[PDB]
Design a protein around this ligand. Structure first.
Ligand SMILES: CC1(C)CC(=O)N(CC(=O)N2CCC(N3N=C(c4ccc(OC(F)F)c(OC(F)F)c4)[C@H]4CC=CC[C@H]4C3=O)CC2)C(=O)C1
Ligand SMILES: [Mg+2]
Ligand code: NI
Ligand SMILES: [Zn+2]
Length: 329
């Protein structure tokens, strides 16, 4: 009834689960390629979600292992390690002082479940690629948030596998509310929605109201769900805000994925997508641009919403940006 030694080393790494900068790649190695399952399980226990939602522990574990198995280990970026990272980053963001006691347990469950499923069965190519190849996914979803629709459908469908229904004890009202929030959150991870999400986050910062011991006041679904959508979207765009050793691995992985797509586009005579051309790449300059036009603007606005809680995150981002700028030939 005692942990094996590897299990003990893993449990020690998992003590960083409330920290930005958790060694997720190390967790992946120590868990036998089960970082999503072990991180989710830790977070569910930490937040007492099993008791609150009457989730049988065997059902949770079965679901999580099934979910993690529907991420592809042969995709370099959009795999179970990325899912685990987004979950853990969401979990840290949800714990920010400015949001203490703001969200209900069901909202919390929604954000974390959404994070866990948000890229499941990702094939390692873009929506545009799927559309332009006439792929079955694109046809199924009428070219509209193709991947994100698929991630949702798979994540929910997996609940029907043997002993996988983690929501079996929720009432229909709880399930309907949970399902709606999860859908709203995952669909918001499609980068085509980024400018609208950010515009709404800015509007919210400009009209910010604070209240119950200085935490945010969010008094309607539209504001509550916008915050959660931007929170998971921040987590999804969190790689440049992490310690350089983590960030660089994520950059290597996304570049591998992008260049593989570009190889497939080149071989078939298609126009090669932005940053998919390994023969015409500027990895460093691309990171600086990604930070300047997308990641910083979002994280700066998030940092304003939760001021001053996210200052060290924004400082790390700004440091990493200078690092990449400095390596430009
Ligand atoms: C603005 C430019 C100067 C630089 C640039 O980016 N693009 C392409 C571009 O703007 N977009 C929008 C974002 C898209 N996108 N990009 C992701 C991503 C993740 C990690 C990255 O690096 C490192 F953190 F690991 C990364 O870095 C590299 F691209 F810079 C990109 C994902 C984000 C969310 C969901 C799915 C992934 C997704 O949809 C890609 C297309 C330019 O065209 C010029
Ligand atoms: Mg995605
Ligand atoms: Ni595969
Ligand atoms: Zn993602």
């Amino acid at each position: 009834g005692v942990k094996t030694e590897q299990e003990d080393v893993l449990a020690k790494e998992l003590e960083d689960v409330n920290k930005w900068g958790l060694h997720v790649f190390r967790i992946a190695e120590l868990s036998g390629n089960r970082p999503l399952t072990v991180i989710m399980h830790t977070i569910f226990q930490e937040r007492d979600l099993l008791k609150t939602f009457k989730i049988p522990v065997d059902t949770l574990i079965t679901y999580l292992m099934t979910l993690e198995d529907h991420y592809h280990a042969d995709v370099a970026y959009h795999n179970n390690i990325h899912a685990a990272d987004v979950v853990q980053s969401t979990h840290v963001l949800l714990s920010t002082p400015a949001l203490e006691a703001v969200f209900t347990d069901l909202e919390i469950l929604a954000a974390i479940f959404a994070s866990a499923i948000h890229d499941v069965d990702h094939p390692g190519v873009s929506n545009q690629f799927l559309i332009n190849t006439n792929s079955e996914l694109a046809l199924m979803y009428n070219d509209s948030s193709v991947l994100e629709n698929h991630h949702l459908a798979v994540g929910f469908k997996l609940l029907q596998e043997e002993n996988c229904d983690i929501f079996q004890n929720l009432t229909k009202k709880q399930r309907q509310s949970l399902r709606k929030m999860v859908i709203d959150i995952v669909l918001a991870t499609d980068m085509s929605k980024h400018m609208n999400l950010l515009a709404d986050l800015k509007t919210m910062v400009e009209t910010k109201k604070v209240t119950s011991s200085g935490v945010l006041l969010l008094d309607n679904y539209s504001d509550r769900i916008q915050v959660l959508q931007n929170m998971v979207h921040c987590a999804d765009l969190s790689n440049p805000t992490k310690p350089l050793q983590l960030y660089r691995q994520w950059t290597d992985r996304i570049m591998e994925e992008f260049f593989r797509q570009g190889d497939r586009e080149r071989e078939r005579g298609m126009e090669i997508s932005p940053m998919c051309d390994k023969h015409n790449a500027s990895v460093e300059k691309s990171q600086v641009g990604f930070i300047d036009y997308i990641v910083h603007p979002l994280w700066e606005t998030w940092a304003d919403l939760v001021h001053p809680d996210a200052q060290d995150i924004l400082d790390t981002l700004e440091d990493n940006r200078e690092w990449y700028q400095s390596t430009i030939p």
